[PDB]
């Protein structure tokens with residue numbers, strides 16, 4: 001049979017999800033329960049997977065397909081038919097996949113990189129122009145950078161999020177909506193007077209996001225166009241199979257999904273990577289050397305990012321220890337036995353604990369908690385399906401190369417232009433908005449006096 005956590009009667013496991021940090025609670029639960037453990041809530045059942053040998057079967061394209069998590073279903077209201085939230089047996093997913101995949105490529109990455117620099121320059125100039133006494137809120141400023149990067153590159157819109165003291169209205173509203181998604185999963189009873197207040201708020205926040213997208217289409221509508229871009233590939237992009245462009249109503253959904261999924265994950269990754277680089281001096285020294293040798297010219301070139309090897313290794317290791325996308329869910333496409341020990345009826349839902357998967361001691365050695373980028377010196381040596389932070393198969397992050405390209409480029413310039421000091425020996429605190437980010441992580445960054 002299949003182990004499961006403590007069920008309080010009617011609500012079963014569901015009351016456990018109330019905590020600020022659900023994914024970490026599930027990791028604790030997985031440490032004790034074992035490879036797999038069942039997780040049943042009233043009206044929904046899902047089995048969490050933590051051992052790699054089960055992950056490799058769950059990941060097979062001809063064995064299990066992607067299922068929408070309970071929270072992702074609520075995410076649909078602003079995101080919807082966007083690939084991250086669209087179904088695999090969904091029409092719009094296939095159309096959008098085929099026509100937005102060419103917008104991510106080597107030629108594409110070249111298209112986006114020159115504009116990425118601009119936003120990273122805004123970040124570097126902000127940190128260079130800070131006074132000596134001031135300190136930097138890494139996750140906040142990383143979200144600040146990532147929004148502007150994705151906006152300017154993939155939608156020709158400058159959020160100008162750096163010119164704002166407080167988080168952008170988009171950030172506030174997005175985080176708040178994710179709040180309801182998670183917090184309504186954990187909720188026992190769907191209807192109650194009080195929730196109406198909440199409900200009100202969540203109509204409000206969403207609108208802001210909607211309103212913001214209205215600018216991108218309107219702005220580009222009024223200003224000059226015909227400059228190859230994601231938003232172009234959405235307006236004028238056409239489906240090879242059906243010869244059809246995207247639905248305007250669906251184009252806006254694409255914009256929502258891309259704006260949201262392009263910063264939170266990348267910004268959490270940058271914060272986590274900087275944190276781990278701060279806790280270990282030597283792993284920084286190596287990367288500070290790499291960025292200097294690889295990037296000579298003041299502005300990084302499209303080729304210079306790919307030339308950076310150690311930066312990508314650092315990013316992959318930091319992404320291993322704390323994958324910014326905490327989990328993905330999968331349903332069985334036909335009756336199978338998982339591991340040869342657990343029989344599952346078709347359509348059964350299994351969630352996958354990516355951070356617990358990376359902590360499997362058998363594959364990654366008996367010092368998994370140890371953060372050493374050198375593990376990724378020969379990334380070929382890593383076993384199959386043991387390391388899947390970006391997802392699996394066709395369903396895995398069309399712009400993952402953009403994630404790595406922006407994050408590597410930015411981090412290379414950060415280590416190039418700055419010296420990082422940790423004034424609090426920061427206690428690692430992970431805030432969850434369906435995504436993992438350090439909370440309270442503050443460092444100072446002295447200038448290195450490098451141009452542009």
Ligand code: MNH
Pocket residue numbers: 066067082083084085086093097257258261262263265266269323324325327328329389390391392394395396397398399400402403
């Ligand atoms: C860090 C970086 C990063 C991580 C950890 C990441 C994680 C994921 C994971 C996991 C999935 C699959 C979810 C599931 O349930 O199967 C996924 C799918 C997706 N992701 Mn991303 N993703 C990005 C960067 C990331 N993504 C960026 C950047 C973009 C946008 C430019 C993006 C846009 C998507 C889209 C779109 C999908 C949907 C793919 C599909 O369903 O066909 N992404």
